[PDB]
């Protein structure tokens, strides 16, 4: 974004308010009122010259039951938590290293007919 | 051996692969028409005479006592010495194999028109199962006559045959069959020398022996280059059959055989491989105890014959063969030639 003079004014006022009142949560509709009254010829010149530096910044800016692997990894999830992308990497490595997957595939074989029907 | 083109008359469509020619006193006749006999010729038998390279097929009639045999493709045909012809097996227009046997004999010859007698011979004992592509010949031993029948094909037996392969065929068991026409009985002989099944071979009969040449064995799918001699002895007791392999056998399936002179025959045509036709011709010289197979000069085949995939034919008898190759289709289906010797 590119920031007008009034906008720089409002930002600096928000910075002042935060440093004066740290534990304080500002309301927006009242803050725009008080900032607009403060803006409504010498004070504003600082913000006026700041805005052209921000314009230069703009120029710079332009430049189905699950797989047997799924049945196995769901259960092994708690042990890895005790030990997502990282969890799945570990799950896949240990599943690859493992008659081991015959029971999970029998459960999936029971579930395949149920998906079909 | 001179090759000659032949023209054909209005009923050229009758002539098909598996047809047969029979010779009665020099007059040739034709049997095995395509489709069932029509009212133009109810017997299915035709006087087959070629005059000046034009063939006219004219209907012949039967005797009152005759059977009306169905047209048969690839039956075993044989000449019997009073002259008569034996037809055994073959396919009917309905693709059934017939187990029957028929006898073709001239009943009458008044004013050069011939009436035939077709009588069915009943057969008991070890009757050969219905077949096509098989040989039958008559041997003479010690003043006795006996019929020999070898090889061929049939459909699967009723126990194993299934509709999905309803048309599958298998070689018959290679048992030699002695068949006495006098009594109507048949005797089967299993021989060690005849191990494989064989069909579409050539058969040559002299005295008490029959030579078995070439053929195709379905199980192996080979066209063996073997020759088998089969001798039959006719003593007062039960006859005995002895077989001998004799090397120097031709390799040809579906070849045609004709007799040029007594004791010399020519073997032409047929196939050496499924895609390779046998263009060479062989001469057989017979000795009372010996058989001689000699390469002879190949005929001047035309380019049609050379490049045809299939050819078919039969022997006309006077050392002249009637040949057929598939022709152009719209014209006439087959192109016919005559090769003389």
């Amino acid at each position: 974004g590119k920031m007008s003079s009034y906008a720089f004014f409002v930002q600096t006022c928000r910075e002042e308010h935060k440093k004066k009142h740290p534990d304080a949560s500002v309301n927006f509709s009242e803050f725009s009122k008080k900032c607009s009254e403060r803006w409504k010829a010498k004070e504003k010149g600082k913000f006026e010259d700041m805005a052209k530096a921000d314009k230069a910044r703009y120029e710079r800016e332009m430049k189905r039951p699950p797989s047997a692997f799924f049945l196995f990894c769901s259960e092994y999830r708690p042990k890895i938590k005790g030990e997502i992308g990282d969890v799945a990497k570990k799950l896949g490595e240990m599943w690859n290293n493992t008659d081991d997957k015959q029971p999970y595939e029998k459960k999936a074989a029971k579930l395949k007919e149920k998906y079909e029907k | 051996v001179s090759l000659q083109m032949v023209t054909v008359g209005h009923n050229i469509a009758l002539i098909q692969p598996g047809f047969s020619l029979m010779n009665f006193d020099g007059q040739v006749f034709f049997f095995g028409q395509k489709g069932w006999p029509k009212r133009s010729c109810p017997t299915g038998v035709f006087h087959f005479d070629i005059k000046q390279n034009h063939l006219k097929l004219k209907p012949a009639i039967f005797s009152k006592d005759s059977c009306y045999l169905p047209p048969l493709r690839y039956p075993a045909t044989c000449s019997y010495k009073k002259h008569q012809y034996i037809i055994h097996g073959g396919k009917t227009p309905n693709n059934e194999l017939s187990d029957k046997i028929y006898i073709m004999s001239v009943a009458c010859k008044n004013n050069k028109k011939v009436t035939f007698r077709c009588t069915e011979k009943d057969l008991v004992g070890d009757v050969p199962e219905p077949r096509y592509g098989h040989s039958i010949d008559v041997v003479y031993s010690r003043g006795k006559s006996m019929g020999v029948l070898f090889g061929g094909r049939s459909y699967m037996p009723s126990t194993q045959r299934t509709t999905e392969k309803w048309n599958s065929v298998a070689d018959c068991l290679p048992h030699v069959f002695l068949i006495d026409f006098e009594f109507g009985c048949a005797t089967s002989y299993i021989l060690p020398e005849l191990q494989d099944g064989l069909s579409f071979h050539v058969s040559i009969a002299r005295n008490d022996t029959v030579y078995i040449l070439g053929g195709h064995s379905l199980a192996s799918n080979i066209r063996p280059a073997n020759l088998y001699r089969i001798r039959v002895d006719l003593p007062l007791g039960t006859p005995a059959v002895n077989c001998t392999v004799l090397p120097g056998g031709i390799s040809v399936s579906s070849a045609i055989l004709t007799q040029t002179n007594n004791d010399e025959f020519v073997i032409v045509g047929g196939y050496q491989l499924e895609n390779q036709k046998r263009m060479v011709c062989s001469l057989v010289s017979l000795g009372d105890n010996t058989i001689e197979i000699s390469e002879m000069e190949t005929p001047d085949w035309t380019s049609d014959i050379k490049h045809s995939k299939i050819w078919f034919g039969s022997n006309m008898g006077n050392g002249t063969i009637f040949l057929g190759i598939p022709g152009d289709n719209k014209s006439e289906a087959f192109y016919f030639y005559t090769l003389r010797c």
Partner: protein, 618 residues
């Protein structure tokens, strides 16, 4: 800056223009509607739409606030493909283009429709035969089978010049039944029977066979096949269940001659007239069929095993093919009926009093009588004795009449009488070929002027349908001088139009009972008209189909209930599907054309698929 249109602005921009009406709306909602601005704008918009007759957008917005997803099940996509005639290749264009514009996959991709097909084709459902079928395999996953059925093709054998594919007869039937399940259930229900009731059902099947000409041969390597096809089809005609001592019509085909229910069973490129190849290919089919006559098919419909017995009626055959497959002589012969032993001369003198005597069984006997000649007879006498049966039958047909060809042949005869009435042949016996040519040209021109019929080369179903009217006789009388013969023609046509409904309707008993009642009476006067006022044509001769029509129609009707529904016309209409599917629904190559057409022709006959298209008509 002229105010832009409100739709062009950015969100922020449209906010500023509507901020005045936005605050005015938040009031209405808190005062009248519990502060539901969402539901008060949703309703104001929807109502604005239907105010401008824009119901579609409103109805869509409704579906998207409900949020239900839109997508067709694959089987429903299949039905739309199969029944609107789209090719996979065209349907893929439709699918792809919809999914790219909507962003949603309304239609399913082809691999799924191809999976949806599997249920609807033979070889998917399991069944068994008690007793087991003789000579048939008991495998149940047999789909499309090679139609040559292991026909030997080695160069020594007889030359194989056809390509053919088929279904296994039972496996096919099974697939038909399972296609009809819902219609079988609902047919019990409307008969007040138990859905789950499983007694001995009975399936009557119509068998049809025909040849086609003018089937072009493809380029490419393959058998050099003939330019003709043959088709064997069956239609499921009725199913009755035995509940007590009553047979309950669970199902009857509403449209017995529709292409929609003539199911394909065997396609071959071959010539019906080539007996050797015809029997080679069809004999395995007749064997399978023979086997099913002596077994009961137990098959599982809706959970409950049911049993089906089968009755086979071969009636969709033209007379040419009947005679060919039942060993009878060709239609030229003196033995003019395929239903009786009458002779052409006899049918001309008696005309009406003949009963049905021939049968597939009788014929088989008589061939054997022919072949063996047991009374050592002469060939004239032998042929007399066997009444022309001089070849061995191989297919069992009902002795009936095909309406389509009957209707055709009859009209073709009338077209001839018309000519010979124009030339006054009733009075001048001899006439040059040139003189007859012009009789036909006269009549041809006139049928065009008075009836809007262009001449056609060979006679037509619709031409017959339109020629055999009394209006056409009026037209034709304008060309005949003698009104004594206007009266003869008018009567002859009256009798015919009294008769025709008997052998064309589905239930004559219900649909023209007085035509059925009078048939023996009307057919006598027709016969007598031909014998007196039409001596010149009908002395000593009559046409095959006049005989069939005058002598055997009432017997047939009491044996079977209908003629018109056993007619070939359903199968002939199937030929039209053959030509289309070979062009536009098959791989375009010699070794795939038959099966692709066989399969996709079967789907087109599936009631399950057809049902989805009558869903609008709940």
């Amino acid at each position: 800056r002229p105010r832009q249109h409100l739709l062009s602005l950015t969100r922020r921009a449209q906010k500023h223009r509507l901020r005045e009406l936005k605050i005015q709306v938040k009031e209405f909602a808190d005062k009248e509607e519990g502060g539901d601005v969402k539901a008060v704008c949703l309703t104001l918009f929807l109502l604005a739409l239907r105010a401008r007759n824009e119901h579609r957008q409103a109805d869509e917005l409704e579906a998207i606030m409900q949020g239900r997803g839109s997508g067709l099940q694959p089987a429903v996509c299949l039905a739309i493909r199969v029944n609107t005639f789209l090719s996979c290749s065209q349907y893929h264009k439709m699918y792809r283009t919809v999914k790219a514009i909507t962003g949603r996959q309304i239609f399913q991709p082809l691999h799924a429709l191809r999976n949806a097909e599997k249920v609807l084709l033979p070889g998917y459902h399991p069944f068994e035969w008690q007793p087991p079928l003789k000579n048939v395999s008991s495998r149940t996953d047999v789909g499309i089978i090679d139609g040559l059925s292991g026909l030997a093709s080695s160069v020594d054998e007889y030359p194989v010049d056809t390509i053919a594919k088929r279904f296994r007869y039972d496996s096919a039937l099974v697939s038909a039944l399972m296609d009809m399940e819902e219609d079988i259930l609902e047919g019990m229900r409307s008969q007040d029977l138990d859905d789950y009731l499983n007694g001995p059902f009975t399936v009557v099947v119509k068998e049809s066979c025909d040849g086609m000409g003018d089937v072009s041969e493809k380029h490419g390597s393959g058998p050099a096949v003939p330019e003709k096809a043959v088709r064997f089809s069956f239609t499921v005609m009725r199913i009755t269940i035995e509940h007590g001592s009553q047979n309950v019509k669970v199902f009857e085909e509403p449209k017995p001659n529709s292409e929609l229910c003539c199911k394909p069973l065997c396609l071959m490129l071959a010539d019906e007239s080539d007996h050797e190849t015809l029997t080679a290919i069809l004999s395995p089919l007749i064997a399978e069929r023979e086997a099913m006559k002596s077994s009961e098919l137990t098959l599982e419909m809706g959970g409950i095993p049911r049993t089906f017995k089968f009755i086979f009626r071969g009636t969709g055959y033209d007379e040419k093919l009947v005679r060919e497959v039942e060993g009878l002589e060709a239609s030229g012969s003196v033995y003019i009926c395929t239903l009786c032993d009458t002779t052409r001369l006899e049918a001309s003198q008696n005309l009406v009093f003949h009963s049905i005597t021939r049968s597939h069984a009788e014929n088989l006997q008589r061939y054997e009588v022919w072949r063996s000649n047991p009374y050592h007879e002469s060939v004239e006498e032998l042929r007399d004795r066997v009444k022309g049966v001089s070849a061995k039958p191989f297919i069992e047909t009902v002795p009936s009449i095909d309406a389509l060809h009957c209707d055709i042949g009859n009209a073709a005869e009338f077209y001839k009488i018309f000519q010979l009435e124009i030339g006054e042949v009733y009075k001048h016996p001899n006439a040059s070929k040139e003189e007859r040519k012009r009789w036909q040209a006269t009549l041809d021109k006139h049928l065009r002027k008075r009836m809007n019929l262009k001449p056609i080369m060979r006679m037509n179903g619709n031409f017959a349908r339109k020629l055999m009217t009394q209006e056409t006789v009026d037209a034709v009388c304008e060309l005949i001088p003698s009104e004594e013969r206007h009266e003869a023609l008018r009567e002859l046509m009256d009798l015919y139009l009294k008769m025709k409904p008997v052998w064309r309707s589905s239930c004559p008993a219900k649909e023209c009972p007085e035509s059925l009642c009078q048939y023996s009476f009307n057919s006598q006067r027709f016969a007598e008209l031909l014998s007196t006022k039409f001596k010149y044509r009908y002395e000593g001769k009559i046409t095959n189909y006049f005989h069939k029509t005058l002598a055997h129609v009432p017997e047939i009707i009491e044996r079977d209930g209908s003629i018109g529904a056993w007619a070939s016309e359903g199968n002939e209409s199937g030929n039209k599907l053959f030509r289309r599917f070979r062009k536009m629904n098959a791989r375009q190559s010699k070794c795939y054309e038959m099966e692709d057409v066989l399969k996709h022709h079967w789907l087109y006959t599936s009631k399950y698929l057809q049902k989805f298209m009558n869903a609008h008509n709940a």
